[PDB]
Design a protein that fits this description.
It comes from Homo sapiens. This protein has seven helices and no strands. By secondary structure, it is mainly α.
Length: about 140
């Protein structure tokens, strides 16, 4: 049955747990609707400290948007409007206030990340980048 039944991939960041899953789902739904409002509600509902919220946000941005950019099918690529909405929200988000975090987020949403345009190496690198930036 396997070959007839069959394109989803894994999300190892789930190691963080239910809070990451909730924030990721909220971010995804908000981007698809192009309505950067549920992200704030999810971030308020989250209970981890600010640095963990910032890391979680960066990981969700990468997993959804940056990975979507890697599909050769341009139709899957985020539309300019989704980038504009998430950029405005990043600009207004206080948890992302450090210039470096805001720049890294926007670079993820617009595919301007240097050299982090294999899959496993890129995923691990982006996790490390988030930890290094937010890690106090």
């Amino acid at each position: 049955d396997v070959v007839k039944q069959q394109p989803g991939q894994m999300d190892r960041y789930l190691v963080y747990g239910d809070e990451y899953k909730a924030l990721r789902d909220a971010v995804a739904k908000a981007v698809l609707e192009c309505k950067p409002l549920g992200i704030k509600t999810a971030l308020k509902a989250c209970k981890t400290p600010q640095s963990q919220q910032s890391a979680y946000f960066l990981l969700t941005l990468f997993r959804e948007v940056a990975i979507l950019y890697r599909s050769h099918n341009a139709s899957l690529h985020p539309t300019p409007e989704q980038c504009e909405a998430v950029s405005k929200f990043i600009g207004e988000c206080k948890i992302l206030s450090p210039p470096d975090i805001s720049r890294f987020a926007t670079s993820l949403v617009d595919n301007s990340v240097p050299l982090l345009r294999d899959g496993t190496v890129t995923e691990m690198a982006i996790h490390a980048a988030a930890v290094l930036l937010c890690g106090q």
